[PDB]
Amino acid sequence: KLHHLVDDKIHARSTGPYSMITQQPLGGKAQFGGQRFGEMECWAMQAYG
Amino acid sequence: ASADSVRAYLKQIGKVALLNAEEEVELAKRIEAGLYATQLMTELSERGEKLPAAQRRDMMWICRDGDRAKNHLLEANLRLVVSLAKRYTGRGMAFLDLIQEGNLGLIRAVEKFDYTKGYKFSTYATWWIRQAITRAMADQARTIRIPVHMVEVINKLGRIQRELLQDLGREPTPEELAKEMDITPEKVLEIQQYAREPISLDQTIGDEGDSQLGDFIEDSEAVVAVDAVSFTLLQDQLQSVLDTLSEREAGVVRLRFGLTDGQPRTLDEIGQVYGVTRERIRQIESKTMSKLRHPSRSQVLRDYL
């Protein structure tokens, strides 16, 4: 049984903490944070239109 | 390159030849004569004299010669400023700023000065230059400005704690330092708390240079989203419930708790704008409060608290 259990991985956020200098949502499961909607995903949804 | 302005300055100040007590006496006499000359020229300028040409011309010569001598002595002792300032680097301010502040202290030392006491310039100036460098390093060093009395007691605490750390081997306790400095332990703790250096939000908390502290600081003052909407809903529900009250009752409540302008009116004002006595206002107040305590219009607003 490997140490990659689901309870350590599942995560969700509707509204939580916010970063300080920039006002983005924070990062990581220790906080709530969101998932980085990075550059490549921006390309993907530009490609869909 | 020669980008080191330290060098660009030292090679500059190594020019003017170094002087002696003999030339110092001559220079100081010239400076004082010039300052006196300009003082008298200002005095005789006002309501005064159509001066003789030779007299006026050469007293202006003295006035300018005094400044020449002053600047000459300043250039002479720039090197002394450097020699005294080198020892206060490695911490706080930078070398160049220290040299400039020490120069200011030197202007003060040559200004507020005497030569009839018969002393080499450095003896007296050294004191001033050291004082000026220390004054600057105290005020314009720490980001949050802490004043000089507090700075000196901070330094005394630091020295005592450090020396007694080595003496004891173990770190001194707050009562040991409080007894040593003849101050109170809470003051020891306060000073220690004031020695804390504001960390930089610019630091690679991760090994590679991509993770900065400023990107992990929850701002515990932001709009909670649900809190704001909840407050709006509370406003609405409370407004409705108060509208259940009678006109006198609604008015007394709104004015008593400032729901109409944000100004909390008190009993005398409310009785004045309604033209009754404040006891009547307080009775209507108590009656209304008791009515609202009734579960019918109460349980609706309980959750907001």
UniProtKB/Swiss-Prot annotation, chain A:
- Signal peptide start-end: none
Domain of life of the native organism: Bacteria
Q: Could you give the subunit structure recorded for this chain?
A: The RNAP catalytic core consists of 2 alpha, 1 beta, 1 beta' and 1 omega subunit. When a sigma factor is associated with the core the holoenzyme is formed, which can initiate transcription.
What is the role of the protein in this entry? DNA-dependent RNA polymerase catalyzes the transcription of DNA into RNA using the four ribonucleoside triphosphates as substrates.
Family per record: Belongs to the RNA polymerase beta chain family.
The protein's name in its UniProt record: DNA-directed RNA polymerase subunit beta
Organism the protein comes from: Mycobacterium tuberculosis (strain ATCC 25177 / H37Ra)
What stretch of the complete protein does the chain hold?
Answer: 1031 to 1079 of 1177
UniProtKB/Swiss-Prot annotation, chain B:
Q: Where is this region: Sigma-70 factor domain-3?
A: 152-228
Q: How does it assemble?
A: Interacts transiently with the RNA polymerase catalytic core.
User: Would I find Transcription regulation among this entry's keywords?
Assistant: yes
Q: What is its main location?
A: cytoplasm
Role: Sigma factors are initiation factors that promote the attachment of RNA polymerase to specific initiation sites and are then released. This sigma factor is the primary sigma factor during exponential growth.
Listed under GO biological process in this entry are: DNA-templated transcription initiation
Annotated region Sigma-70 factor domain-4: the residues are 241-294
Molecular function, one GO term: sigma factor activity
Query: What is the organism field in this record?
Result: Mycobacterium bovis (strain ATCC BAA-935 / AF2122/97)
Q: Which residues bind DNA?
A: 267-286
What Gene Ontology cellular component terms go with this record? cytoplasm
Where found? Answer: Cytoplasm
Q: Where is this region: Sigma-70 factor domain-2?
A: 73-143
Residues represented out of the complete protein? 223 to 527 of 528
The domain of life is Bacteria
Motif interval(s): Interaction with polymerase core subunit RpoC? 97-100
Please report the name of this protein according to its UniProt entry.
Answer: RNA polymerase sigma factor SigA
